[PDB]
Coordinates of C-alpha atoms and ligand atoms in Angstrom, one line a residue:
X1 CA 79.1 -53.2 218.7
X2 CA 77.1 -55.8 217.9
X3 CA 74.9 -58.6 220.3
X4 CA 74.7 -61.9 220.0
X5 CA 71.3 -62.1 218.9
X6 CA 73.3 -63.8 216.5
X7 CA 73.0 -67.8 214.9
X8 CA 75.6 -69.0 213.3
X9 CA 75.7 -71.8 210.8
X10 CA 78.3 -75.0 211.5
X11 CA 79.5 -75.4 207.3
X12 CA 82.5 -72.6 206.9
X13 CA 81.9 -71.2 203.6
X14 CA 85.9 -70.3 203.9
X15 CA 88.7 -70.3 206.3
X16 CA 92.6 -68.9 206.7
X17 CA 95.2 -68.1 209.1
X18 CA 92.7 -65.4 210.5
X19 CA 90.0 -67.5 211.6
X20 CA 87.0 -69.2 209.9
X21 CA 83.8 -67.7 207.4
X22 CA 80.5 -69.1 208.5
X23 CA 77.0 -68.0 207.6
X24 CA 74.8 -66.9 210.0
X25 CA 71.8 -64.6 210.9
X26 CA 71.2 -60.9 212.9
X27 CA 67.8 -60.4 214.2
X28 CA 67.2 -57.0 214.0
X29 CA 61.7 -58.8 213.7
X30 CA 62.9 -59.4 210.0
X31 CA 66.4 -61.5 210.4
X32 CA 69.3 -60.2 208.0
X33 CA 71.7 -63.3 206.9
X34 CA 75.0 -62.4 207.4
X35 CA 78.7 -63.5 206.3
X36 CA 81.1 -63.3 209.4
X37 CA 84.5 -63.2 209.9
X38 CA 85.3 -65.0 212.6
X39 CA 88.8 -65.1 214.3
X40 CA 90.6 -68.3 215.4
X41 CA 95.8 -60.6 215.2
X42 CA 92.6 -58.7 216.2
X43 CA 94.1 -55.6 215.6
X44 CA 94.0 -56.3 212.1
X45 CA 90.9 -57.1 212.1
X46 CA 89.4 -54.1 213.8
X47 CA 91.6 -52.1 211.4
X48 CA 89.7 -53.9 208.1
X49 CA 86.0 -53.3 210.3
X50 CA 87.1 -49.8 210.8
X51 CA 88.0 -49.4 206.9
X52 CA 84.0 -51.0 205.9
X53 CA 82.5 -48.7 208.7
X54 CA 83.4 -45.7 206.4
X55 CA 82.0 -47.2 203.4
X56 CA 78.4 -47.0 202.3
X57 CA 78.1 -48.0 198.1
X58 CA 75.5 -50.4 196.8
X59 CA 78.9 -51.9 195.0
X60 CA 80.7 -52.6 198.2
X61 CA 80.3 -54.6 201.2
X62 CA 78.4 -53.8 204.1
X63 CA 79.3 -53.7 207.3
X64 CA 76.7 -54.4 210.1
X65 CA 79.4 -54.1 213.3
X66 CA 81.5 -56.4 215.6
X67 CA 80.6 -58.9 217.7
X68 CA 82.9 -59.0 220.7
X69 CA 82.5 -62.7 222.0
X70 CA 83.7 -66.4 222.1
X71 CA 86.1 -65.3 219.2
X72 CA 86.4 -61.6 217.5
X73 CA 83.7 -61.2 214.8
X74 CA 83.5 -59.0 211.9
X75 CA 79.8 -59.2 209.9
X76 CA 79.2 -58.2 206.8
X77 CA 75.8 -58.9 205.0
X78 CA 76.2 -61.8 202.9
X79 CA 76.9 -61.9 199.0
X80 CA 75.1 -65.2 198.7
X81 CA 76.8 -66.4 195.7
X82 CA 79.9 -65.7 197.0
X83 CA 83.4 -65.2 194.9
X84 CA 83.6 -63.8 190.9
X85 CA 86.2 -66.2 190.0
X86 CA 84.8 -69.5 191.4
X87 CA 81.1 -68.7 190.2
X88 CA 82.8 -67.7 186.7
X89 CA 84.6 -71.1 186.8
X90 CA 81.4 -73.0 187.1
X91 CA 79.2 -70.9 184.7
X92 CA 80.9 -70.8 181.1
X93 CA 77.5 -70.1 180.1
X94 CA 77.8 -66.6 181.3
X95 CA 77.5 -64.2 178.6
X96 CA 79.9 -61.2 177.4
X97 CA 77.1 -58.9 178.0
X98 CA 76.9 -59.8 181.4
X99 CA 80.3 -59.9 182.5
X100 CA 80.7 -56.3 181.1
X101 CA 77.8 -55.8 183.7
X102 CA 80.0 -57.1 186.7
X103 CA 82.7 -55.2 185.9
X104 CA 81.1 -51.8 185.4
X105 CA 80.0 -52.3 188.6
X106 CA 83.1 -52.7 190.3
X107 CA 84.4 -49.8 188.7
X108 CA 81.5 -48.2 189.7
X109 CA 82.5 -49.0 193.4
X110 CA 86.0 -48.7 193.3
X111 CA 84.8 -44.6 191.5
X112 CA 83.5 -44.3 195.1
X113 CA 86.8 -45.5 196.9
X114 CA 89.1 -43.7 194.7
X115 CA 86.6 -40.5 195.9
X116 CA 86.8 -41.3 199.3
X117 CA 90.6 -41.5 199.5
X118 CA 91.0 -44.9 200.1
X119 CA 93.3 -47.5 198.4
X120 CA 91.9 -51.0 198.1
X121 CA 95.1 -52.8 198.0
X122 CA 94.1 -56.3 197.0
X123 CA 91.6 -56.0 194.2
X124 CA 90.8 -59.5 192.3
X125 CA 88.5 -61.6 191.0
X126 CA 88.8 -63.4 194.0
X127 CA 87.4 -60.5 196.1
X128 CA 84.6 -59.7 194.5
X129 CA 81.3 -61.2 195.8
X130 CA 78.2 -61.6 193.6
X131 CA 74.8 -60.9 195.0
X132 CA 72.9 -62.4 192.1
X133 CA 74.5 -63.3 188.6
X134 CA 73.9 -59.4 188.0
X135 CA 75.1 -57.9 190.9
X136 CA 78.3 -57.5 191.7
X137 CA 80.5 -56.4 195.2
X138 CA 84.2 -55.6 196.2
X139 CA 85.2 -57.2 199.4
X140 CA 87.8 -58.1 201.3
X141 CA 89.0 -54.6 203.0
X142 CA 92.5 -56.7 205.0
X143 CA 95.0 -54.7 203.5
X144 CA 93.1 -51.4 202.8
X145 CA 94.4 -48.2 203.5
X146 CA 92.7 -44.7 203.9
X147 CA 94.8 -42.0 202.1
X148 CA 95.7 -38.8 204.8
X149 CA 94.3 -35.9 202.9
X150 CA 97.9 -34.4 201.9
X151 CA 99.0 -37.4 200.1
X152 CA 98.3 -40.0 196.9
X153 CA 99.3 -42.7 197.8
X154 CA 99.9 -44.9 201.0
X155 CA 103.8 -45.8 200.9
X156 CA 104.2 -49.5 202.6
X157 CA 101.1 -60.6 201.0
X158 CA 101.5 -59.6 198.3
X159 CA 99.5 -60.0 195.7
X160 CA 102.5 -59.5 193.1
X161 CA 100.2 -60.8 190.0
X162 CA 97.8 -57.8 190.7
X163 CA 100.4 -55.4 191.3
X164 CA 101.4 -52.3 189.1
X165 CA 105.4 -51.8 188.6
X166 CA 105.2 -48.8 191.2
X167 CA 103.9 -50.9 193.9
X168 CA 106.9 -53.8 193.3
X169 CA 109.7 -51.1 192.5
X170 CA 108.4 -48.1 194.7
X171 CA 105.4 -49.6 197.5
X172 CA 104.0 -47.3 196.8
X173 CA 100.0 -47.5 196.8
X174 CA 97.2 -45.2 195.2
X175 CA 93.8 -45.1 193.0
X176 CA 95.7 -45.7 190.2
X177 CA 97.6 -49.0 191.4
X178 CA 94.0 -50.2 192.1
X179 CA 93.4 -49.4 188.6
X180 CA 96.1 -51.4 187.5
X181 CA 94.5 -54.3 189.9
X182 CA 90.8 -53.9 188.2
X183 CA 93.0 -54.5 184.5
X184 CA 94.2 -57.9 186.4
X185 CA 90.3 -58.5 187.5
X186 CA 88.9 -57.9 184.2
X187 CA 91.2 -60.4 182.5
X188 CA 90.9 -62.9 185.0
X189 CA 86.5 -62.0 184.4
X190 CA 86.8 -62.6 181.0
X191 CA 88.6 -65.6 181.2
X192 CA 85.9 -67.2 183.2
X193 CA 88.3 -66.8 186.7
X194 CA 91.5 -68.0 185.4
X195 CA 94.8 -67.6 187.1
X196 CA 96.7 -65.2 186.1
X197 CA 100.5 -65.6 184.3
X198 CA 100.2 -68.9 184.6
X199 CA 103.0 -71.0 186.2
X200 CA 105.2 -67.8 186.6
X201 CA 106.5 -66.7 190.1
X202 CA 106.9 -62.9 191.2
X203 CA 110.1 -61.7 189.7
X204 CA 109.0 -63.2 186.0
X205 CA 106.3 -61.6 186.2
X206 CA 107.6 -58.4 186.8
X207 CA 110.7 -59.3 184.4
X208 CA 107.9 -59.8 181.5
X209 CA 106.2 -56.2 182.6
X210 CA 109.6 -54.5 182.7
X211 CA 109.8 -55.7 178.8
X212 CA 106.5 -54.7 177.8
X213 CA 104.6 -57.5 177.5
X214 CA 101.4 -58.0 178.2
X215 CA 98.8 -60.9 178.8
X216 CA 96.9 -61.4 175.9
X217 CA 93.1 -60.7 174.7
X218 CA 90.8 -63.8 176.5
X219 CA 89.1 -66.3 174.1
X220 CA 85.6 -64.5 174.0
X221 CA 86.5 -61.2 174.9
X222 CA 85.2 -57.7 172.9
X223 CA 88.2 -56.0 171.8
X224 CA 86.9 -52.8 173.0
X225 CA 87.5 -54.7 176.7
X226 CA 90.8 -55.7 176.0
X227 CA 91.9 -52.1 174.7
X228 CA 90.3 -51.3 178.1
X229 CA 93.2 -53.7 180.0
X230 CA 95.9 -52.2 178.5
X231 CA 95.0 -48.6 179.1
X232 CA 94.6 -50.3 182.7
X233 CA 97.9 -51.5 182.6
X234 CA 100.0 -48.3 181.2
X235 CA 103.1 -48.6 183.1
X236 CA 104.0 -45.4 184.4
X237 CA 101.0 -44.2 186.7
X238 CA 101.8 -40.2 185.7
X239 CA 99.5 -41.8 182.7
X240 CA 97.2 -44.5 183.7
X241 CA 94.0 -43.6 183.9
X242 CA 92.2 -42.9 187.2
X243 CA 88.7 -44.6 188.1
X244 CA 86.6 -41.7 187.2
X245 CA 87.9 -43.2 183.0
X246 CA 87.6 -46.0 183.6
X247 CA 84.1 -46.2 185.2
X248 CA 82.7 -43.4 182.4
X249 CA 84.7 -46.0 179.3
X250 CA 82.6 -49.1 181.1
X251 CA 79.6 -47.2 181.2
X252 CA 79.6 -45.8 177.5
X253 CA 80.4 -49.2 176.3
X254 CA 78.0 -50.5 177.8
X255 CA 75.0 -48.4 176.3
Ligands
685_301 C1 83.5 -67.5 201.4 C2 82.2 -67.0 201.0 C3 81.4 -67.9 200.4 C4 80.2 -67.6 199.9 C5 79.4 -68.6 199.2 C6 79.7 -66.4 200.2 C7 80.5 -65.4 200.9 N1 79.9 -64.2 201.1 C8 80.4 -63.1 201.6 N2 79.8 -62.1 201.6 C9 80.3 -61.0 202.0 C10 81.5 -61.0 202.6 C11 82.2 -62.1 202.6 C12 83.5 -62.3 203.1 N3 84.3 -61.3 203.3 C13 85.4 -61.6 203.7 C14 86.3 -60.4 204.0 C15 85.7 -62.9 203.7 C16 86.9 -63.5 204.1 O1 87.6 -63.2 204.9 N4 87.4 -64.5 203.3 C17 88.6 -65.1 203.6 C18 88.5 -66.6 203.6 C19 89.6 -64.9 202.6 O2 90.7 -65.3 203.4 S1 84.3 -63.6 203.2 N5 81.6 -63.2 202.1 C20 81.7 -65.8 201.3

């Protein structure tokens, strides 16, 4: 558990039903800045802390521990250029190259999760944190589950635009619904962070999956990418592709 040998900054970088996200610093004599979650239930909260304890992956999150004191806290070292979709809003220059970059790197972190038996549960563009322009984090562990090691999948928001069909129709959860999620990400990474199915609710959505439709190929986006989506989005999971091909498809393409 964590001391306050802890500053924290007054601007919140974010805030929520939770609590509020300020910036702040751990003294450890070099000082680590630090992003921290900062409650305004805990129990949710020590679940999400307990999830990022288990995790080590230069493509995920760290955790540094809790602080127990004025208000819950949750730290995590700080992604300084915070969320994929916002910073890919504000930098059209950002080149195809580059985002391919990003995204192999999630994949590259959500190979490890898949690995360690965990479901992410909420993977978007809007969870993923950049360190610099070229490196890329998954955050936000809220609604993560770790798998028991008899089962697939964890059986249960929501995030119903980043859901696969199993998930809506089943609830169930598994590596392979997160790939479905990481189809959503990539789309909404090559459209510079654009919303996805615009101006649709929940129940077109899924209508419009049921029928076979998919979103379509982004303005500057490599085919090879977009092939990528849709192997993402197959909609029986007995078929989709698990993280292990997707990661080695990201990493081939981009050598
Ligand atoms: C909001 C924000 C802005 C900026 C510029 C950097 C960051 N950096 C950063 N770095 C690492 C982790 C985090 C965060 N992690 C979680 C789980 C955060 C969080 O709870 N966000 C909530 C507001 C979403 O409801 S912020 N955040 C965050």
């Amino acid at each position: 558990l964590d001391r306050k040998l802890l500053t924290l900054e007054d601007k919140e970088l974010g805030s929520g039903n939770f609590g509020t996200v300020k910036k702040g610093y751990y003294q450890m004599k070099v000082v680590k800045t630090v992003a921290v979650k900062i409650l305004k239930l805990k129990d949710e909260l020590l679940a999400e802390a307990n999830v990022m304890q288990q995790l080590d992956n230069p493509y995920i999150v760290r955790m540094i521990g809790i602080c127990e004191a004025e208000s819950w806290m949750l730290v995590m070292e700080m992604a300084e250029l915070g969320p994929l979709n916002k910073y890919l809003q504000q930098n059209r220059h950002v080149k195809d190259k580059n985002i391919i970059e990003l995204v192999h790197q999630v994949s590259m972190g959500m190979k490890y999760l898949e690995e360690s038996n965990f479901v992410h549960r909420d993977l978007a563009a809007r969870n993923v944190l950049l360190v610099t322009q070229h490196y890329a984090k998954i955050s936000d562990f809220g609604l993560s589950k770790a798998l028991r090691a008899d089962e697939n999948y964890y059986k249960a928001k929501w995030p119903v635009k980043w859901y696969a069909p199993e998930c809506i129709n089943y609830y169930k959860f598994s590596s392979k619904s997160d790939v479905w999620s990481f189809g959503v990400l990539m789309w909404e990474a090559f459209s510079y962070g654009q919303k996805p199915y615009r101006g649709m609710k929940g129940s077109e959505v899924t209508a419009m999956l049921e029928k076979g439709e998919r979103m379509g190929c982004p303005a500057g986006c490599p085919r090879e990418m977009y092939d990528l989506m849709n192997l993402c989005w197959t909609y029986d999971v007995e078929n989709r592709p698990g993280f292990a091909a997707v990661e080695l498809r990201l990493r081939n393409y981009y050598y």
